[PDB]
Amino acid sequence: QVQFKLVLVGDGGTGKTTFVKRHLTGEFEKKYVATLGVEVHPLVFHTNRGPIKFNVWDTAGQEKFGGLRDGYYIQAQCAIIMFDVTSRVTYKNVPNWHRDLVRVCENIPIVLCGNKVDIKDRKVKAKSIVFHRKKNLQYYDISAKSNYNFEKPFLWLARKLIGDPNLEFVAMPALAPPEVVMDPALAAQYEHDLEVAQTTALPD
Amino acid sequence: HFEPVVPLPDKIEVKTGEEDEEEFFCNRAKLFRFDVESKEWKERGIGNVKILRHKTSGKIRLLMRREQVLKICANHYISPDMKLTPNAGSDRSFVWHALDYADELPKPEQLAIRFKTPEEAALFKCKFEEAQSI
Ligand SMILES: Nc1nc2c(ncn2[C@@H]2O[C@H](COP(=O)(O)OP(=O)(O)NP(=O)(O)O)[C@@H](O)[C@H]2O)c(=O)[nH]1
Ligand SMILES: [Mg+2]
Known part of the structure; x- marks a missing residue:
């Protein structure tokens, strides 16, 4: 079994949670609902050297939590520092987080992500980004709304963690599903209640 | 450079669980699962x-x-129980119930699939049903 501790940190609103909850459900949360001091979900990626599990500690952003987000950090093996790009403020703070991290757990692979690069009115210009260079941190433009590069972060890390610079994500074993027979009332009812659904307009 | 934490896993006869089957149909589309937890x-x-x-x-x-x-x-x-009903007249998407296993755990999700065009939906409809005709 292959598992790694991943702590996702960064100013609230940056999309940290939306990012993870998309790699988990393939859903896109349009609404903002602040994470109450870290939430953990696991993410699995099938690679050529087998599958790997990422234990993601989706932490909070509101400083009102500044305290506790140190225990969240203990024994973490890698982190994704994320900022909005559509809100320069976020980028400004970046250096702060990078510090909090290297405080409890020095070195350790870290990816810097400028999420939301899908929105036109971009504010944190490309040439603006520099911290990743001065701090030696892999950076990538992301877009939890367009999946844009949303795997590169984990992939990059995976490699670092394992040791195979060429390790690569590759489809996913489409294992055989379960067997469910009998129609009677069974499927006859499955019909009625299904009305409730299709009577709910479709997104987009 | 970060020293690796986990011992190097041998490569793999990269499966795909695909094969042993043949594509009776294959088009790209967008998939939807209902929530109920809410209603969205x-x-x-x-x-x-x-x-x-x-x-x-x-x-x-x-x-x-x-x-x-x-x-x-x-x-x-x-299954022959599954019935691809339209959806708000959307002749480009359908909804059906299925004890899906996408997560490698059986869950009875109600689904919706939407296609770029109607021709594509129609073909999906056909082929889907043609696969029930067997
Ligand atoms: N268009 C667009 N919207 C995005 C993107 N990523 C996430 N969102 C939006 O970001 C908003 C807030 O992000 P969210 O993930 O909820 O916040 P967070 O980054 O987790 N902050 P915290 O957990 O600390 O409270 C949501 O309304 C969601 O629609 C993106 O790439 N672009
Ligand atoms: Mg959140």
């Missing part, structure tokens, strides 16, 4: 919906995967 319909995935019939067993299933990352987001076997 949720985006489940974007990629290719396939319709595979086992070469041997002959069991036709509906496997959908997501592009870029490639992860199943549909895995159930097509």
